[PDB]
Amino acid sequence: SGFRKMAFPSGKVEGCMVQVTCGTTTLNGLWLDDVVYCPRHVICTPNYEDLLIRKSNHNFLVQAGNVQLRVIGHSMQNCVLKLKVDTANPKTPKYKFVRIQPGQTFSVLACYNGSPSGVYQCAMRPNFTIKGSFLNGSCGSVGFNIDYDCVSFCYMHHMELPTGVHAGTDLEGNFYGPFVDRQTAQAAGTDTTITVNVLAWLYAAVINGDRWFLNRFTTTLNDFNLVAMKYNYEPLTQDHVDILGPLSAQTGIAVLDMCASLKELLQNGRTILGSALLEDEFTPFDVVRQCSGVTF
Amino acid sequence: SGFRKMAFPSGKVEGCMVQVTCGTTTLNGLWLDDVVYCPRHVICTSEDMLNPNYEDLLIRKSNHNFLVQAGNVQLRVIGHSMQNCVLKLKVDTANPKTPKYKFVRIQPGQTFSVLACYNGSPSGVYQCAMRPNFTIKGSFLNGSCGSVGFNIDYDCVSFCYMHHMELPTGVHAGTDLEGNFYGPFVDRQTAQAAGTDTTITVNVLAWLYAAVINGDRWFLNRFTTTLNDFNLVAMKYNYEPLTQDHVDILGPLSAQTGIAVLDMCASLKELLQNGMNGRTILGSALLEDEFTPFDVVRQCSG
Ligand SMILES: *C(=N)[C@@H]1C[C@@]2(CN1C(=O)[C@H](CC(C)C)N(C)C(=O)c1cc3c(F)cc(F)c(F)c3[nH]1)C(=O)Nc1ccccc12
Ligand SMILES: *C(=N)[C@@H]1C[C@@]2(CN1C(=O)[C@H](CC(C)C)N(C)C(=O)c1cc3c(F)cc(F)c(F)c3[nH]1)C(=O)Nc1ccccc12
């Protein structure tokens, strides 16, 4: 029993982290095969096309611990810098690049100077920001999930907003949300609660012996959606009902019955899983992987 | 900026996890050098779990009775010895992935990362704290015994915990890497009760300093208190006593924010009497006690 904010085992990702230095700027790089992916803002003192044409291969100092890697080429893809290196990473795992949807979670391996400092779970907020923990030097730190034995890289850290939340790109350099890689005052849209994730966390509470919030009532998907609007909650789709199915069968509580419990919880407000708020940073798959004991 | 429940990168520990099987029992083992450390209850029979005689069961075991697997590589056991509640299995090959490591025994209130494993393979990593009643609030299912707790300063892995059992309340109990249980727990399937748990006061105060560092000031007040008056309050709320030693360790955080410890104590006293009134501190609607003053410094400074 027990329910914690559990990250993925970061072992496969640590073997990919390298230090990238350009001028007086030092950040992190993701070494996969013979390419090092890192935020392009490492070339700033901005016109990225201009600054990149004025760079040579040896202008980029890449370090894998104490081993200096020789840059044999460089190219830009959106907001990511791709540095071709002479040696392929022997610790390159089975990996792929994915772009996650708002509401999806991932583990962040925070790094400084190419070395991993810590690991934590994060959710891609519906306003396309992450509520992470990043200090100066953590750009290039990545977000990932693990399915079977494949690392799915979904996030690269680029910036912090004046509000304290963070923003970054997928591994193709495409920013999540309306953010740009300029050191300018940027504002995130009004954030909303990930409804399907709160429902999955309520199923995790039933699995761990918390039933006080349950009620006899059931609802329709349309009535529950009218309620979600009045509370800044993301709409619940029929697709979300299908992904909640396995958790609904394991507890014997229909999704629309748990929706009537969530409606009641939102109108009145005890603790659930040691929290005094409705937690939205656990997907239905996060609940299954923790409560079923999925390994990697 | 930002404040999260941050675990240590588990890479160095994943390379040490092996699967240990004894009879019909399968659990996790920690492979360091040519020794595999695991909970000794792996030698218990499904029938006699209440009062096993470990010295008696270990004398009737041979090296070939222990099946150790490192992924797909079966390791040959060349010897076996018992140290308190841990079983140490001498193996023929030294772990090539053995990191720089040491064994430490933590004090209640201290935090650490838990690499949860099943069948020798890592499932997940979370942050934990040694509760004042000597239990941990882990997330563990059957087959998780042998999973370890660790801290990684510089490049050395401090192994401080090995998972052994779950108590009827859903909390967990285990040993240090010398096999000494934390608390009054024994490795038997006998009726065991953890004492009434209490809140780690110094950790809540450190987390309040982390909130000021991250721009949360709503809970602050002009009042100050004495250490003795605050301690009378802590009792009325099931909080552990705040000692002068705790004031000293909180010093660096107090100097970085300019808020005296006894002033933050008057804010905690106020927070305990009213609550949150709908407000949140660092995204939590409760007073968090699982961050030591050193965890706050690690995360906020680097
Ligand atoms: C990456 N190495 C660091 C880590 C940091 C963001 N970051 C950057 O390099 C950012 C690059 C820009 C996208 C060009 N960066 C400097 C910012 O995001 C940034 C700078 C400021 C301010 F000066 C003021 C401000 F109000 C603001 F919102 C800013 N954002 C990160 O994740 N956290 C952090 C803290 C301190 C310095 C750097 C970074
Ligand atoms: C380790 N492989 C598993 C994981 C589990 C505890 N655990 C054990 O093997 C424990 C060994 C004892 C110390 C001999 N174990 C069986 C328990 O701690 C245990 C068994 C029971 C009960 F039958 C009833 C009960 F009320 C109780 F509190 C028990 N504790 C773990 O951490 N969580 C878990 C869940 C289910 C099975 C095993 C384990």
B14-18 long-range contacts, Cβ below 8 Å, gap at least 24? B14/A9, B14/A11, B14/B115, B14/B122, B15/A11, B15/B95, B15/B97, B15/B98, B15/B99, B16/B95, B16/B97, B16/B98, B16/B99, B16/B148, B17/B115, B17/B117, B17/B120, B17/B121, B17/B122, B18/B68, B18/B69, B18/B70, B18/B75, B18/B120
**Around Cβ B100, how many Cβ atoms within 10 Å?**
10
Supply A25's token pair: 């700027």
Q: How many residues comprise chain B? A: 302
Asked: is B1-14+100-197 a CATH 2.60.40.420 domain? The reply is no
Burial class (CB in 10 A: 0-12, 13-18, 19+), A162: exposed
What is A192-292's CATH number, 1.10.1840.10, 3.10.20.440, 3.90.245.10, 3.90.1150.10? 1.10.1840.10
Task: Quote the ligand 1 centre to B282 CA distance (angstroms).
Answer: 20
- Residue extents of the structural domains in chain B: 1-14+100-197, 15-99, 198-301
* Identity of residue A70: R
Supply A7's token pair: 């990250």
What is the resolution of the experimental data for this entry, in Å?
2.0
- Superfamily covering domain A15-93: Trypsin-like serine proteases (2.40.10.10)
Judge: A271–B286 Cβ closer than 8 Å, yes or no: yes
DSSP per-residue string spanning B89-100? EEESS--TT--S
Give dist(CA B216, CA B284) in Å, integer. Answer: 12
User: Are A211 and A251 contacting, i.e. CB atoms less than 8 angstroms apart?
Assistant: no
Q: What atom in ligand 2 is closest to the CA of residue B165?
A: 18
Same fold, A15-93 and A192-292: no
Experimental determination approach used: X-ray
Last residue before each break in chain A (C–N > 2.5 Å): 45, 269
CA distance B215 to chain A (A): 9
* Third-level CATH fold of B15-99: Thrombin, subunit H (2.40.10)
The C-alpha R_g of chain A, in whole angstroms, comes to: 21
B156 phi and psi, to 5 degrees?
-105, 130
- Picking from B117, B70, B109, B281, the residue whose alpha carbon sits closest to that of residue B198 is B109
* Identity of residue A130: I
- Picking from A196, A5, A212, A109, the residue whose alpha carbon sits closest to that of residue B288 is A5
Q: Which residues, including other chains, have CB under 8 Å from residue B137's CB and lie 6 or more apart?
A: A2, A4, A274, B128, B129, B131, B171, B172
Judge: B11–A8 Cβ closer than 8 Å, yes or no: no
Pocket (CB within 6 angstroms of ligand 1): A 27, 41, 134-139, 158-162, 166, 181-183; B 1
Give dist(CA A131, CA A129) in Å, integer. Answer: 7
Architecture of domain A1-14+94-191: Beta Barrel (2.40)
* A139: annotated active-site residue: yes
Residue B260 CA, distance from chain mean position = 29
Left, alpha or beta for A34 (phi > 0: left; psi -120 to 50: alpha)? alpha
Supply A32's token pair: 């996969």
Architecture of domain B198-301: Orthogonal Bundle (1.10)
Residue B275 CA, distance from chain mean position = 28
